[PDB]
Amino acid sequence: EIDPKDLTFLKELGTGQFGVVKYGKWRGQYDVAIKMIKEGSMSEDEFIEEAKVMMNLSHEKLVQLYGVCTKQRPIFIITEYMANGCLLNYLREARHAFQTQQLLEMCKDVCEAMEYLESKQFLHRDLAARNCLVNDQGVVKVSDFGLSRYVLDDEYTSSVGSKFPVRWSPPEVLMYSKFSSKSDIWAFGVLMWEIYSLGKMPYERFTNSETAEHIAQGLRLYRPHLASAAVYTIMYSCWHEKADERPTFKILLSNILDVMDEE
Numbered sequence: 064e065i066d067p068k069d070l071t072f073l074k075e076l077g078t079g080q081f082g083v084v085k086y087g088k089w090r091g092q093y094d095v096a097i098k099m100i101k102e103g104s105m106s107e108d109e110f111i112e113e114a115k116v117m118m119n120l121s122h123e124k125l126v127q128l129y130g131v132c133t134k135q136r137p138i139f140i141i142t143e144y145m146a147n148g149c150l151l152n153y154l155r156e157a158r159h160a161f162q163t164q165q166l167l168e169m170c171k172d173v174c175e176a177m178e179y180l181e182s183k184q185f186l187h188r189d190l191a192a193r194n195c196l197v198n199d200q201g202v203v204k205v206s207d208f209g210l211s212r213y214v215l216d217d218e219y220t221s222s223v224g225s226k227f228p229v230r231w232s233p234p235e236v237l238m239y240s241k242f243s244s245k246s247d248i249w250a251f252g253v254l255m256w257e258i259y260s261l262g263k264m265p266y267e268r269f270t271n272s273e274t275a276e277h278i279a280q281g282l283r284l285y286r287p288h289l290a291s292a293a294v295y296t297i298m299y300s301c302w303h304e305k306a307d308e309r310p311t312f313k314i315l316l317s318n319i320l321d322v323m324d325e326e
């Protein structure tokens with residue numbers, strides 16, 4: 064529970080699923096991002112009850128939750144601040160002129176954070192490049208893991224909603240609402256595709272509806288030009304028809320480390 068007197072608001076960072084997010088300072092020292100939870104957007108009591116668990120998720124490659132301000136409205140969520148923002152926009156800036164080793168390192172950063180979440184049996188449920196952030200050192204961290212459960216907007220939480228992450232979802236999620244560790248694995252494979260394609264929309268010439276059909280017929284994202292056969296094999300393994308044949312994040316990490324040493 065952070066005291067709001069210890070917070071100063073400095074600049075707007077943007078708008079997310081819970082409304083505005085600001086950059087600011089905590090205890091006049093520490094850079095923070097501060098979510099200002101838009102009223103009616105969030106199942107607040109549920110989030111408050113379970114913010115403990117999330118506060119104990121602590122990994123270098125997770126965007127760290129520092130605290131909450133819940134004795135007021137709107138409530139605040141205070142996190143680690145990531146200078147370079149959103150990985151999706153970072154990818155799309157041609158000026159970075161990334162080496163492929165840098166692209167694989169971005170995959171590795173994310174895999175580390177997901178391997179940690181997996182060990183804690185904690186699902187992200189919305190893993191994608193838009194939900195990763197980049198710090199001042201070019202480190203990628205996984206953001207907003209687990210917060211999908213508190214979203215009140217039906218366009219977001221429904222499979223058929225205009226905001227649902229259809230393109231990052233396995234067939235069993237879309238057809239049956241079968242969520243598991245393997246549905247995060249699927250999304251992680253799509254995320255690797257986003258990275259190696261420098262931020263293209265997955266299934267860029269299909270709608271959400273056509274994408275659901277395409278993947279239910281056993282068809283998949285093509286190899287991005289920048290991806291080697293071995294990088295392609297890693298992402299593609301994430302999209303096995305049978306969820307139980309997809310790798311774990313621990314396996315994916317050893318595969319990424321292998322390609323790194325090899326290529």
Ligand SMILES: CCN1CCN(c2ccc(Nc3cc(-c4cccc(-n5ccc6cc(C7CC7)cc(F)c6c5=O)c4CO)cn(C)c3=O)nc2)CC1
Nearest residue numbers: 076077078079080084096143144145146147148207210211
């Ligand atoms: C004038 C240019 N500005 C300065 C440069 N630039 C910039 C630089 C740094 C940053 N850095 C940062 C931006 C955000 C941020 C800002 C606004 C919205 C969201 N966001 C996005 C999606 C989202 C999805 C869910 C789904 C699961 C339900 C739940 C959510 F809560 C959110 C959410 O809040 C975030 C990301 O948290 C968070 N953190 C920590 C940063 O460090 N952001 C932007 C862009 C803006």
